[PDB]
Structures are given as C-alpha cells and as structure tokens.
Amino acid sequence: SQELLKDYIKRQIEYYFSVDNLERDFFLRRKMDADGFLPITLIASFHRVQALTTDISLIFAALKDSKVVEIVDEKVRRREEPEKWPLPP
Template sequence: FLFSVENLCRDIFLRSNMDHQGFIPVSTIASFNRVRSLTSDTSIILDALRNSAVVEVQGDRLRKRHDGASWAL
C-alpha cells in the first residue's frame, strides 16, 4: 500500500523522507500507525518484504521497485 502509485502521488511525507535514490529507512515505515499496529520490529518488516515484487530491500532501506528513484523529492 505505502509504495503504490496512488499513495506515492499524494504522500508528500513519505516522499520527503526518501534519499536521492528513492530509499526510505525501514524505521520510518515502522513508525507509521498502520504498520505499527502489526509490528514495530524492523527485522520482521524487512523479512516480509525481501521477496516482494513491489518493494526493493537494500540493507535497512526500502524503495519502490523499478522506478523508486523517480519518486524522491
């Protein structure tokens, strides 16, 4: 959901926390209420997303797969 085109079009906070390559720290994602209601454990979040077709995991950072850098502000 967070990395959907629909959400990225309107979520300026998420995009403003991206680095120039479009990556965002998993700790930022873990702080969101919707994610925190499931878990705040960043290792669980990273493990869950590691094989995602939508999200790319690099270390402790996440970005939209394929065109992630284009969403950075």
C-alpha cells in the same frame, strides 16, 4: 506463528509504495534519498504497521517477500522507477 501477520505487514507497506499513494504522499517522498530509498525504521513507525508489530525482523521478512519493493541494508525503495518520486524536504 507470524506468517499471516507477515502477509498483513507486506500488503500494508506495498500500499505505501503504490503509485496511487505516492502521487499524494508528499511526506514519504521528502524522506526519500535521491535514489528513492527510505529507512525501514521510518516505515515501521507508521501507525498501521506499528499497530501490527514492533518486531523489526518480521518487517524485514515481510519485505523480502515483495515484488513491489527492494531492500538494501537498512533501507527500502519502490523497485520500478524509484528516482521519479523523491521530493525536496
């Protein structure tokens, strides 16, 4: 089973995309495209996600379970007003 693991991964990534985090997370914001999207494999590299798993299908399945984020292809963004967050690299 991976259901509980998927829940821990979902809540960890939803933290990165919370307003509280985004107001100070200048690294993540400089890795966004102008539409807010980031590579899912960049999120996978973050220490608290990588501690839980290196299984990319599990990470995608965790994110399909989220009302906070939106996946398109290989990228993920905050669903609400994502264009407000990108910063210059």
